[PDB]
Amino acid sequence: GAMDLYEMSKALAVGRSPQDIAATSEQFIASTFHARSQVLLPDDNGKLQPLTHPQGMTPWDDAIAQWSFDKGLPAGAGTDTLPGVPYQILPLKSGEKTYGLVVVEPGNLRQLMIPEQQRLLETFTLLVANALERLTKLAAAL
Amino acid sequence: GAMDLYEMSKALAVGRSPQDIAATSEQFIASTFHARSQVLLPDDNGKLQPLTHPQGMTPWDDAIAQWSFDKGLPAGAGTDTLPGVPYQILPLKSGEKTYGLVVVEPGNLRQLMIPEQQRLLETFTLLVANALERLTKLAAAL
């Protein structure tokens, strides 16, 4: 919806931990895009977590997810890497830096892949990345 | 343009000071929205600076700008406060917190006030606010 980005922005603004941000991002991306989603965040070694998938989502390839994060490039539907899977693997990027990934598995892939929807989803991932960037840089400072 | 938000996001990501962010924001808002713009930032006392206007912009009311910042509400064209002026005064807000303002004076006010353009401009102000929030919170931490 028209107001969802603004509403998510308010919810992200008060997130206090990466988990808060991940939960908020999943809530909003799941409702606005009629999808199940999972945010993956790098650990101390730059390895994405969780390695498990939630009930209701199709398992994705963990190594291709790691590739997406490492290269800051999308994979899955809409790309030439795993073009046939029923989900998207999207980097959460601010500038050239990737702070995490979101895996998005829509109830209706043709609906998610409508270009206007893709452009909206890109804006959502930017706002999520900004929140992750803020929390990571603040934690490091402190 | 379609790609301007993403491009501004990349430029904001590498901003190192509020002045960097202000300059970037003015560059992009001015080009994407065919407008002149000025970002105003609070000083130590929460008073907006600069108090002067650049060549090429109509002078705005400094106290109404301060009102907009203090209340986190827009003024100028499109609002019931100074509805007749040829510019907008927009808070740069992340969540409930306002980090600054942007004054936007378009070459063609009817074009700027097209609702789709307003919705795009709102997204721009969100990204700018996020950058200001990041820099302010980091400076405070350090």
Swiss-Prot record, chains A, B:
It is found in: Cell inner membrane. It comes from the Bacteria. Member of the two-component regulatory system KdpD/KdpE involved in the regulation of the kdp operon. KdpD may function as a membrane-associated protein kinase that phosphorylates KdpE in response to environmental signals. In the central section; belongs to the universal stress protein A family. This is Sensor protein KdpD. It comes from Escherichia coli (strain K12). The chain holds residues 515 to 646 of 894 of the full protein.
